[PDB]
Scaffold this active site. Structure first.
Site, PDB file in Angstrom:
ATOM      1  N   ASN B  10       0.640  -1.560   0.028  1.00 13.12           N
ATOM      2  CA  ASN B  10       0.091  -0.093  -0.462  1.00 13.12           C
ATOM      3  C   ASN B  10       0.956   1.236  -0.270  1.00 13.12           C
ATOM      4  OD1 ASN B  10      -1.766   1.737   0.309  1.00 13.12           O
ATOM      5  ND2 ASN B  10      -2.675   1.261   2.476  1.00 13.12           N
ATOM      6  N   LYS B  12      -0.210   4.122  -0.322  1.00 10.36           N
ATOM      7  CA  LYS B  12      -0.894   5.297  -0.251  1.00 10.36           C
ATOM      8  C   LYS B  12      -0.710   6.774  -0.885  1.00 10.36           C
ATOM      9  CE  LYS B  12      -0.373   3.338   4.366  1.00 10.36           C
ATOM     10  NZ  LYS B  12      -0.146   3.832   6.696  1.00 10.36           N
ATOM     11  N   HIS B  94     -10.120   1.279   4.858  1.00  9.06           N
ATOM     12  CA  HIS B  94      -8.176   1.151   5.531  1.00  9.06           C
ATOM     13  C   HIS B  94      -9.358   2.347   6.607  1.00  9.06           C
ATOM     14  CE1 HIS B  94      -4.515   2.150   6.070  1.00  9.06           C
ATOM     15  NE2 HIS B  94      -4.228   1.968   5.499  1.00  9.06           N
ATOM     16  N   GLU B  96      -7.207   4.648   7.703  1.00  7.23           N
ATOM     17  CA  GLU B  96      -7.302   6.453   7.196  1.00  7.23           C
ATOM     18  C   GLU B  96      -8.449   7.088   6.868  1.00  7.23           C
ATOM     19  OE1 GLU B  96      -3.383   5.780   4.869  1.00  7.23           O
ATOM     20  OE2 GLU B  96      -1.965   5.296   6.635  1.00  7.23           O
ATOM     21  N   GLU B 166      -5.426  -4.652  10.845  1.00 12.08           N
ATOM     22  CA  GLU B 166      -4.662  -2.934  10.452  1.00 12.08           C
ATOM     23  C   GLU B 166      -4.843  -2.418  12.094  1.00 12.08           C
ATOM     24  OE1 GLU B 166      -4.881  -1.386   6.696  1.00 12.08           O
ATOM     25  OE2 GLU B 166      -3.204  -2.630   6.929  1.00 12.08           O
ATOM     26  N   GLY B 172       1.803   2.978  11.156  1.00 12.20           N
ATOM     27  CA  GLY B 172       2.759   4.367  10.847  1.00 12.20           C
ATOM     28  C   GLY B 172       3.771   5.090  11.693  1.00 12.20           C
ATOM     29  N   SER B 212       3.552  -1.007  10.685  1.00 12.54           N
ATOM     30  CA  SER B 212       4.481  -0.988  10.655  1.00 12.54           C
ATOM     31  C   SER B 212       6.024  -2.493  10.329  1.00 12.54           C
ATOM     32  CB  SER B 212       4.697  -0.645  12.041  1.00 12.54           C
ATOM     33  OG  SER B 212       4.526   0.866  13.107  1.00 12.54           O
TER      34      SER B 212
END
Ligand SMILES: [K+]
Ligand SMILES: [K+]
Lengths: 249, 249
Positions: B10, B12, B94, B96, B166, B172, B212
């Site tokens: 990904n 992103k 996701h 985000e 996730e 991150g 991560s």
């Protein structure tokens, strides 16, 4: 007299590789005899195809949205990505994004300022809904919208800025905007820019009509004093868009 | 035995034409001996350049987001458009997008169902926040997320569904979950799928970990009983991603 007119094609979330290429072929073969900046705003996916196929000198390519910076924002596209990809025009703050995707007056303002700082030519969209117009709040809404954008801009930045007025109150509502109603909205925006930013800026500012248009009514709409072109929706996916270009002389 | 592992990249909202080209060139020159489905999810803009240059037989291309249908949704990209563009994989829901762009459990579920109905392979993301874990609410949060998805799916749809666990606190932040924390969550998810959807479905279901993941911790993470691969963010933008692929045995 009026500044350089703009004919913008907002394809929105539409198109196949075949259908869009056919439409681009028509645009390429279309002779345009007057000074007008034509803009094609495709989806992010079709940006590569549009770049390679679109060859008309009076046509540039735009994106329909972006966020300010690259980073951990899955699904989104940033301004540096577009800049690296050779896209220098962009539509921001469209009524559908304000409605569906949480884009407030300030969020739109931040994107616009970020785009200008990155060197983009920006078509910033404003406009009031049916609820807002019927409640007699057309003026306060549209002026608040452009005031928020101006707050993050300097006077010199307006050379890169284009304003598009969306009569959202006439978008699938059953209502129909008259040339007089459009002109009144445009003149209002013009008046604000003149007194708040400068008469020089107001005279150079392109204010585009972002409502439903065909070849006929676009000619009438462009006769209005403060109409400097069109940000076209549905008709921009049709050969009719050529007539809309001609409507700007 | 485990089902076919997946190494999902990904990227992103990142990358230039040059930097992503170098990543692809490395991927193309990478010999992958074992059976594993590698996935590259670039931005909408870079889909075309990825389709052209990515040629590794064990790699497929994915979108990072979409909406269900084409239409008046300026700035967005639809499933039919992606299908026409030859993109058959997609990441949905996701963390985000759940946090920034208003994608609730039910919004995610609708997109997943729409994608499956259109013939897409779907990597559906679920995961709890830092507060939700430390308050001991990981189970109720994570299982509620997949339950909302499950309500919109028929049993046959799970064959096209990949689950990506996730945890938001690992996204991150450089705080990767221990192999035990990941395994515990994956075991919880598969147990729920086994009981609610069926033991047959749960046996074939791929559950990926995301958060991560790097070239140093991937191997030990994959050694766990119910880990079937990885969703990789930051390390997928680095040559390190090759090591993650090999870490899937
Ligand atoms: K139209
Ligand atoms: K439309």
């Amino acid at each position: 007299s009026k500044p350089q007119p703009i004919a913008a094609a907002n394809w929105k979330c539409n198109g196949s590789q075949q259908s869009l290429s056919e439409l681009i072929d028509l645009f390429n073969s279309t002779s345009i005899n007057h000074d007008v900046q034509c803009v094609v705003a495709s989806t992010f996916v079709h940006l590569a195809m549009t770049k390679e196929r679109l060859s008309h000198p009076k046509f540039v390519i735009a994106a329909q949205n972006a966020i300010a910076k690259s980073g951990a924002f899955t699904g989104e596209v940033s301004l540096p990505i577009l800049k690296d990809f050779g896209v220098n025009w962009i539509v921001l703050g469209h009524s559908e994004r304000r409605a569906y995707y949480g884009e407030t007056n300030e969020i739109v303002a931040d994107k616009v300022a970020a785009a200008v700082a990155s060197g983009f030519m920006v078509i910033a969209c404003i406009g009031e809904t049916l609820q807002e117009r019927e409640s007699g709040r057309t003026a306060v809404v549209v002026l608040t919208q452009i005031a928020a954008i101006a707050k993050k801009l300097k006077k010199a930045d307006w050379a890169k800025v284009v304003i598009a007025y969306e009569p959202v109150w006439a978008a699938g509502t059953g209502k129909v905007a008259t040339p007089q109603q459009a002109q009144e909205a445009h003149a209002l925006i013009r008046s604000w820019v003149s007194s708040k930013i400068g008469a020089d800026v107001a005279g150079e500012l392109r204010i585009l009509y972002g409502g439903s248009v065909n070849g006929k009514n676009a000619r009438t709409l462009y006769q209005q004093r403060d109409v400097n072109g069109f940000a076209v929706g549905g008709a921009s996916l049709k050969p009719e868009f050529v007539d809309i270009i001609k409507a700007t002389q």
